[PDB]
């Protein structure tokens, strides 16, 4: 038998080395284990970081080093950059049972980022959608960090909660977080209030984008 364990999440800084430990467990482990470390950017194919204990693949930066201490293996990243935002996985290959087992993965989060206010875009119900009899009010939040921004929909200057859907923050390629909010309204409801607004709370701040039923 063989099983792996990885830390929940590790955090460093944009100029410092950090270590992530894959801990292996087995019973009477006289078996031959080959260890590899893989990098995964959000929504992209995993890439081979380390094989063996300290072998780096060609075309991979020399900032990634590996070590084996007893059973536990370790990835050390020095010269940490914002480009190393990813998840890291450890894979153990057992030659006898000839099986490779992965771990839970670690989220390598850096702290060297600035707090940027979100950009909020509000879209009036579409003309085709308006003919469709269901109004979908679109609110897009772009370029925010750290990524936890709540959305409040206001109709007629009062809070509204029915039909509001918020997508979880997603890491944009440009080193920013973005999210979408959709408000579903009846076609008669859309021509009911004077003006509806989106109030976004990114970090303390509140950004208000207004759109009225007078789109015309």
């Amino acid at each position: 038998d063989i099983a792996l364990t990885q830390p929940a999440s590790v955090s460093g800084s944009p100029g410092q080395s950090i270590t992530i430990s894959c801990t292996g467990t087995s019973s009477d482990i006289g078996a031959y284990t080959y260890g590899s470390w893989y990098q995964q950017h959000p929504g992209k194919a995993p890439k081979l970081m380390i094989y063996g204990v300290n072998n780096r693949p060609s075309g991979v930066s020399n900032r990634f080093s590996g070590s084996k201490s007893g059973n536990t293996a370790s990835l050390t990243i020095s010269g940490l950059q914002a480009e190393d935002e990813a998840d890291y996985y450890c894979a153990s290959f057992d030659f006898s049972v000839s099986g490779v087992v992965f771990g839970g993965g670690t989220k390598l989060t850096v702290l060297g980022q600035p707090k940027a206010a979100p950009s909020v875009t509000l879209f009036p119900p579409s003309s085709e959608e308006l003919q469709a009899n269901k109004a979908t009010l679109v609110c897009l939040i772009s370029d925010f960090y750290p990524g936890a921004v709540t959305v409040a929909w206001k109709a007629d200057s009062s809070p509204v909660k029915a039909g509001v859907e918020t997508t979880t923050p997603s890491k944009q390629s440009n080193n920013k977080y973005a999210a979408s909010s959709y408000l579903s309204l009846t076609p008669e409801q859309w021509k009911s209030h004077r003006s509806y607004s989106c109030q976004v709370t990114h970090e303390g701040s509140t950004v208000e984008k207004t759109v009225a039923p007078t789109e015309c």
Binding site: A91, F102, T121, T167
Partner: protein, 214 residues
């Protein structure tokens, strides 16, 4: 360059087959072992299958041991994984991987193909233009898409900058929603070519919508 491509995927009613094929070029396909790696949406990676270079050495994982069958064709230079009795839990991205000669590590990974199982039927995207109401943002909203993914190409694919692709939205009703925004010059709004194309592979719906200033 050495390339691994995955084909075969989409929506499968629980119990279907969905034979996946990964085609590989650039390396001698005969001498290298090939693995399949499955990633559930939002969870970690895990291993499914391994085929040796000569064949007849097939190793599956524990979760699937009488359901997935794996065949490499060196003559056609590809490798196929076949599922049977696919439970609702096995919805994931499937990655094709190569084992190096001195085995243990996945040298090259395929792009990935999406396998989703759900009793819901394929619903073609409904495309609506969110028209632009120095640079202004306008775009398209796709409602009622199931399952992912939908390609939203602005300007017939020519447009490449100023286009933000919003992440997919998991609606409560069971369908999806997606949005694509494009930042075009305020003075260029009256002359730009603003036509969007939505390709929904799961239902094979290729729609060309036109968004105009309002």
């Amino acid at each position: 360059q050495v390339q691994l491509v995955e084909s075969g995927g989409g929506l499968v009613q629980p119990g279907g087959s969905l034979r996946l094929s990964c085609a590989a070029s650039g390396f001698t396909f005969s001498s290298y072992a090939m693995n399949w790696v499955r990633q559930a949406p939002g969870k970690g990676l895990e291993w499914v299958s391994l085929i040796s270079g000569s064949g007849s050495s097939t190793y599956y994982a524990d979760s699937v041991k009488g359901r997935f069958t794996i065949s490499r064709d060196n003559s056609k230079n590809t490798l196929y994984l076949q599922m049977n009795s696919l439970r609702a839990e096995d919805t994931a991205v499937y990655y094709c991987a190569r084992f190096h000669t001195h085995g243990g590590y996945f040298d090259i990974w395929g792009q990935g193909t999406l396998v989703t199982v759900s009793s819901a039927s394929t619903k073609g995207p409904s495309v609506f233009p969110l028209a632009p109401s120095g640079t202004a943002a306008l775009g398209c909203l796709v409602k009622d898409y199931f399952p992912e993914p939908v390609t939203v190409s602005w300007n017939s694919g020519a447009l490449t900058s100023g286009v933000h692709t919003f992440p997919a939205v998991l609606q409560s009703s069971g369908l999806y929603s997606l949005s694509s925004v494009v930042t075009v010059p305020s003075s260029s709004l009256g002359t730009q070519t603003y036509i969007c194309n939505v390709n929904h592979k799961p239902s094979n719906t290729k729609v060309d919508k036109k968004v105009e200033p309002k």
